[PDB]
Each structure stands twice: as C-alpha cells, then as structure tokens.
Amino acid sequence: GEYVVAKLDDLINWARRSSLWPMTFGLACCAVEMMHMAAPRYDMDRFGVVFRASPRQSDVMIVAGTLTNKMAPALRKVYDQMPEPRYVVSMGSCANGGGYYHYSYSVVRGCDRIVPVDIYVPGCPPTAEALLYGILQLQKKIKREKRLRIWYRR
C-alpha cells in the first residue's frame, strides 16, 4: 500500500538523480566554467552526469550564459523537445536575471521568463565547484519527489 509506493518512489528517484544527462546551452562565459566541471578536477562524469548528451536524451538543461531575444525562441524549442522528466538549471547572473546586461534592449532579463527553472546558481561566473554544488542540490530535489505517493492518494 503506502509502504510499496514509498519504496518505488525511492527506487525511481534514485535512478533518476544517479543518471542525470545534461544538455548544456553554452551561451557565453559561464559555459567555460561548465567545461571545468567536466574537466578532471571535478569530473562530473563520476557522479553519473555524462559528458556528451543529445537534447532528446537529456534530463536536465543547463542555461550557461546570457539569453538574448534573438536566441530565446530557440532555447524554448529545445526545452519543449526534451522528454520528461526534465529540469532546468540556471547558471550565472545573466541566465538568472540578466546580470551585467539586465538593462540591455537585446537581452532576456532572466531565462525564467522563457522556461521554468529548478535551480539558480549565482555568480559571474559561478565557479566550477559552485555549479557542481547546484547540480548536487538538484539531485537532492529529485530525491524529495513523491510522484507515486501523490498518485496513490488521487
């Protein structure tokens, strides 16, 4: 009953947070720190976060850089093609809320005007370690999901 649903949630949550395949939108300088998270010192692959992931095989989108108006429709399209469950990590001030270019005529003031965001990673850029802290924070967010618990009580 409730015990079986509770453990199934743990199993599927464990599988999903242990196999987070990211689609990186390397838009600007924040993408450089993202590359350093893949580099040997941090090796995001060792957490199960694969290096190369196709957008249709992805579970998390990382918005790493400034989002311009010219680019916003293309970013939304990639998000819409992501199979679920899908999560968005906003990395850096530009993606978080426009940052240094907040008052620009050509810049989206935060990617959360285009897509829902799960984690906001602050910094300009956030260090590779700060990004990794954010990814680990998303994993614990997935760990708290109770999808089957909610479904059982419907």
Binding site: P40, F51, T68, K70, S106
Partner: protein, 386 residues
C-alpha cells in the same frame, strides 16, 4: 540542398551559439552564411552609461577566454587618453599575466578544435593546466576568470607573497604537457588529414579580408603587434614569432602550439625581471589611494570618494588602441567627450573579420571541413557579437 548547422556540439562547449545556413551540392559546400547576434548584448551601448572604471568589467566578458588581455587593451586606451603612464612593476605584471592568458586561450583554442574534430582526450589533460592557471587569476584578483585586475593606471593589487614561486613551478612542467599534446596530434595522420590543406588563405586575401594574428602568420605574413608596435614592456623580452608556410589549418595549429612555447619563454623572463615598486600610477586623481591613506589623509579620502562616484575625467579625444590578443588584433576605438563617461566605445574583435571570411575559406570543401575551419579561426561569440 540547404542545411543549417546546430547551435553547438553535444558536449560542453564555450564558444557560444551560431546559426550556420549552408548551401550544399553533394558533399561540397557552395555557400556559408553565418547568422550571428545570438550573443549580442549591446555592450557598446551599455558602456556609454558607465564611468571608465565601471566599464572595465565589460571587457572581461568579450573574449571571455582572454580576460586580462582584453583588460589590457582597454587600460592602454584610457592611459593614452589620460596621458599618464603605469609604473614599471605593473607593466611587467601585465605582460606576465598577458602571456598566462595567452596560454589559457591557446589551450582552449587547440583542444576544443581537436575535441570538435573527435579527439576528446587532450582537452581533459590540458584543462587541468587551465585549472591551475585559474588559481593564479584567483590569487591576484579573487576571481578565476573575470578578474577585473588590469585597470587604467596599472593593476588593482600587488602579487601576494609566494605567487611567483608557484608560477615558476607551473611553468617548469608546462612544456612537457605541450609535448604530450603534440604526441597526440602533430604527427597523427588522421589529424593531418583533417587539417592539412584545409581552409587555405593567401597572404594577399588575408590582409584585404581584415585578418590578424595567427590568421595572418599562418600565410607567411611576418607581423606581430608585440614586435612591431610594442606596448608595456614587450620590447624588453625575447621571443620568436612562429610563421606558417601553407596558410592552412595545420600550419595555424602549429603556430598556436609554438606560440604557447614562446609564452612560456616570455613568462620565464618576466619571473626573473620583475622589478620592485608600486603597482598603480602614483596619481590619486586617476588611481585610488591606498586604504590606509584614505582613512588618514583628507586629500586621499576626497580623491577616493570622487574616483568611486564620479570617476576621473578623461580629456576629450579619440584613440584606436590595439594589442596582439591571443585571437588576433584586439582594439578599441574610444571616444572621450571630456567627462568621466566614454562617449563612444567601438570594440574591434579579431574574430569578427575572421568569421566574415568563413564563406571565402570554406569554398570547395566538405561539410565536415566547416567544423575544422571554424575551429582554426578560434571564434568566441562574446567578442563577435559584443
């Protein structure tokens, strides 16, 4: 048939996003029409609403692989308009970190070029070296990338005690890392098949198309701004300018690898010739005073107050100042109207003219070659779009 290239590869990439609209006939590329502006953020307009100091961090975020070199270009332009001179120790520090920045850029340029062509492994080896150089940035400025360290008048702070010893230990082993990279690529027949005779550009065309840096020297043009129009203390260091002979991707790759070796050679002289003294110009109407002075002397407090609110006024005038940035000639056309905010700041990004030549360089090549040609130009769209 018409075809559009993807915004970016499926692995982490930090060059930005490009919409490449191509015309193909079979395997061959007949037309290339890059559609940019995907990272256009109106930097040049935003600068007009900033003081000269407030605008300096914008230059970290142009070619965001060559941060301190972009800072140097802007600092030199303002110093020229201000008619002041940074102290000798600051100039040596600027050259030292300018060449550390060149190493950072050339690792990114060479290894991501290889990574996009399918040679993934060198990217990982050399980005550990980049991580150690990020630590030098962080130890002088508190930031791994956007240091905002080089400023008009000199540098923000003096090197912490013990930093130069660590830069020596790093430099001592770096040429071995380059050798390992060359072992993987230089003589590899697959690498040579992907680069030799690809994207040939003649010396005459390279000049007329506005090319600079390695895009000129790969074609045999003997030109390097550090040699011909030296700035800071580049006239006081010895190094050789690598020159290509075929004007293709392979020669440009060899030029970049050899430039890394020359950067180590320059860093070695900087570590030994570093002089003592102050690290920013001793003119408190331009460079803020020391914090202890600001908290004790009435004049220092006033000048600190005014430099951080109004900022220094710059005499009216216009300058085009350029440096040999790792990607080529990086310049600023800076217009001062006499106030503390620049009237106009046009940024000359070397990758702008290089990318405009993609259609010319890709003629008679196949689709997979377009990836190689973009890599050999070393394009970052922060500086292209601004």
């Amino acid at each position: 048939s018409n075809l559009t290239l993807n915004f970016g590869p499926q692995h982490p990439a930090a060059h930005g996003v490009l919409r490449l609209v191509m015309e193909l006939s079979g395997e061959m590329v007949r037309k290339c029409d890059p559609h940019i502006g995907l990272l256009h953020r109106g930097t040049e307009k935003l600068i007009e609403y900033k003081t000269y100091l407030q605008a300096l961090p914008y230059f970290d975020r142009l070619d965001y692989v060559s941060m301190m070199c972009n800072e140097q270009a802007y600092s030199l332009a303002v110093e020229k308009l201000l008619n002041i001179r940074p102290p000798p120790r600051a100039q040596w520090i600027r050259v030292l970190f300018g060449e550390i920045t060149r190493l950072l850029n050339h690792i990114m340029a060479v290894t991501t070029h290889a990574l996009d062509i399918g040679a993934m492994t060198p990217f990982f080896w050399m980005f550990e070296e980049r991580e150690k150089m990020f630590e030098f940035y962080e130890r002088v400025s508190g930031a791994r990338m956007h240091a905002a360290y080089v400023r008009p008048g000199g540098v923000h702070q003096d090197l912490p005690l013990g930093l130069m010893d660590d830069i020596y230990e790093f430099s001592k082993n770096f040429s071995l890392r380059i050798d390992e990279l060359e072992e993987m690529l230089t003589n590899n027949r697959i690498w040579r098949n992907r680069t030799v005779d690809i994207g040939i550009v003649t010396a005459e065309d390279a000049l007329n198309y506005g090319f600079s840096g390695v895009m000129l020297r790969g074609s045999g043009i003997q030109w390097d701004l550090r040699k011909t129009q030296p700035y800071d203390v580049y006239d006081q260091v010895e190094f050789d300018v690598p020159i290509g002979s075929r004007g293709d991707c392979y020669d440009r790759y060899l030029c970049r690898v050899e430039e890394m070796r020359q950067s180590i050679r320059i860093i070695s002289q900087c570590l030994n010739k570093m002089p003592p003294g102050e690290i920013k110009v001793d003119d408190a109407k331009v460079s803020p005073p020391k914090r202890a002075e600001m908290k004790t002397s009435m004049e220092s407090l006033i000048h600190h107050f005014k430099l951080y609110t109004e900022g220094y006024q710059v005499p009216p005038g216009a300058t085009y100042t350029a440096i040999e940035a790792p990607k080529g000639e990086f310049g600023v056309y800076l217009v001062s109207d006499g106030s503390s905010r620049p009237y106009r700041c046009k940024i000359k990004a070397p990758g702008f003219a290089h990318l405009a030549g993609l259609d010319k360089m890709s003629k008679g090549h196949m689709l997979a070659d377009v990836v190689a040609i973009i890599g050999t130009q070393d394009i970052v769209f922060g500086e292209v779009d601004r």
